[PDB]
């Protein structure tokens, strides 16, 4: 009774009464990050209006909740171990804890596989996508991900063996519960191999697709200019995109009608200077376009904004703030922070050309964020999967590796939110405007 085993990170011992304190603390500090990051993504998506890619946001929000639940699920037994151990074998507790974490990691994994297929359909069949990827079908997909995730780890309760190392924070799970080559083989067949195959196969086809060989894409530039500064900025941006192979249609706001103005454009750049003696006022030719902006076809449009102003005014390039706020509220995708020119734009020509270089990545930006999140997710999990396969097969047994690969796999519940939050301009625009109101209180 009360035999001792050395801790995985090399210092101390654990038993039915002794706890590895250093190992418990580094788990607790990671759960704090997972909880904070996922609550921030959930808050900003809902409270700040985050309306572009409504459909794909079903999977991103399901992942943020599954990741919040990983953080809390891990914080509860680790805090409880820091306070005391029961002095007995926690057979059911570690079995139940290990099941929950496995189910939640499966949910995130199947959400990324569905995001890759969602993007494959939006790219190859944008009109079919609009009319056939509906909220009802998105809810059925998420219900099936939860049920299927619960079903594949169900055998861990019926004598098939240990489904992972997550519960090895409990002495009985680490020493007395064994993995099985047959159960690991089952998990790899029903979860790891199929989910990884869907993402790899799907992103392989996404990265091969070319719909336009005559042009990169077609961009509309609409500008409001009273003394010619925003016109010059517009003309400099138009020539940078034309040289890069875009079909560029640049039009003075004075000469345009709002009705269906953005229809047929992959990218729309709205240029407007700020005027008004006393208030913030949009350049005169732009006011009628702003007033009728709900008629332009802005919902799901990729838009970026530019304008000239002067920072002695309290609303520096306020026309740009006002146009971005309305486009966000109309469910446009702000693909890039606005270009806000102080003074003569001829003296800021490098800032203009650099901005125009960045917008060249705007049409593929959202897809590339979802690709980076998918690839970081699988890379952080790969050491765990390799350890699982080799230890289930009895090629090696290394508690230090078991510990480090499991910590790193839990850490993808913090990387998903941090990458998404920092890579979306609409989100960082939702994050800052919500946080400016939460900075006062
Ligand atoms: C603390 C501790 N670690 N351990 C381990 C020893 C050897 C290997 C591993 C692998 C682990 C997998 C893991 C790694 C990181 C985050 C997670 C998480 F899912 F929980 F979050 C899980 S824990 C652990 C013990 C022994 O049981 C103890 C302890 O104190 N025991 C005595 C009271 O039961
Ligand atoms: C009457 C007046 C009001 C202005 N108000 C603002 C303002 O509120 N905010 C700002 O950033 N700049 C303001 N400006 C500076 C202009 O926006 C800046 O000169 C800009 O280059 C004009 O560009 P445009 O030639 O494209 O219209 C104002 C200028 C004038 C003459
Ligand atoms: C890697 C960096 C430092 C190694 C960890 C530092 C070692 C800290 C020892 C605390 C510990 O792991 O366990 C304490 C407990 O009393 C056990 O019975
Ligand atoms: C590559 C992606 C990985 C994901 C990103 C995660 C960021 C990691 C940050 C903090 C985790 C905790 C770090 C552990 C080191 C601090 C050790 C410590 O402070 O423990 C002292 C304790 O008192 C001894 O008893
Ligand atoms: C979908 C796969 C669902 C499989 C879920 C398997 C349930 C548990 C089970 O089948 O275990 C019985 C075992 O054969 C002896 O007790
Ligand atoms: C979900 C919980 C399922 C409980 C089923 C169970 O624990 O059954 C054990 C049985 O002894 C194994 O053959
Ligand atoms: C199944 C094994 C899954 C393991 C990893 C998935 C690799 C399969 C893959 O990448 O397939 C691409 C497709 O064949 C287009 O070339
Ligand atoms: C020890 C085994 C190491 C296994 C190495 C895992 C490599 C991952 C893989 O299967 O490659 C497919 C490729 O990523 C598709 O794009
Ligand atoms: C072949 C040559 C190499 C060139 C670079 C290809 C790069 C990325 C994949 C292509 C993504 C293409 C952009 C699709 C944008 C789109 O129209 O779909 C709307 C949605 O926002 C987005 O998924
Ligand atoms: C056995 C299956 C092991 C799962 C490991 C596959 C990791 C992988 O292939 O990466 C995913 C994707 O390619 C990222 O873009
Ligand atoms: C520790 C080893 C974990 C490996 C962490 C890899 C991070 C990574 O995948 O970065 C590449 C890029 O950002 C994604 O396409
Ligand atoms: C038992 C434990 C053994 C496991 C220990 C080994 C570490 C494995 C983890 C990551 C390797 C990958 C590290 C480098 C990440 C870059 C790969 C990548 O992301 O490639 C796609 C790229 O975007 C264009 O093709
Ligand atoms: C987790 C698998 C390793 C991923 C690839 C290394 C990435 C290199 C970057 C940082 C080093 C972070 C610490 C590396 C973990 C130490 C590995 C370890 O402790 O295993 C060997 C040990 O000396 C006998 O058990």
UniProtKB/Swiss-Prot annotation:
GO CC terms: plasma membrane
Subcellular location: Cell membrane
Keyword check for GTP-binding: no
Residue intervals on the Cytoplasmic side: 46-67, 118-139
Keyword Transmembrane: yes
Record-annotated membrane-spanning stretches: 25-45, 68-88, 97-117, 140-160, 184-204, 369-389, 400-420
GO biological processes: cellular response to light stimulus; G protein-coupled receptor signaling pathway; locomotory behavior; phototransduction; response to xenobiotic stimulus
Pfam family, one: 7tm_1
Keywords assigned by UniProt, alphabetized: Cell membrane, Disulfide bond, G-protein coupled receptor, Glycoprotein, Membrane, Receptor, Transducer, Transmembrane, Transmembrane helix
GO molecular function: G protein-coupled photoreceptor activity; G protein-coupled receptor activity
InterPro entries for the chain: GPCR_opsins, GPCR_Rhodpsn, GPCR_Rhodpsn_7TM
Main subcellular location: membrane
UniProt membrane topology term: Multi-pass membrane protein
Family, as annotated: Belongs to the G-protein coupled receptor 1 family.
PANTHER family in alphabetical order: OPSIN (PTHR24240)
Protein task: Gs-coupled receptor activated by antipsychotics reserpine leading to an increase in intracellular cAMP and its internalization. May play a role in locomotor activity through modulation of dopamine, NMDA and ADORA2A-induced locomotor activity. These behavioral changes are accompanied by modulation of the dopamine receptor signaling pathway in striatum. Modulates HTT level via cAMP-dependent but PKA independent mechanisms throught activation of RAB39B that translocates HTT to the endoplasmic reticulum, thus avoiding proteasome degradation.
Name by which UniProt lists this protein: G-protein coupled receptor 52
Organism name: Homo sapiens (Human)
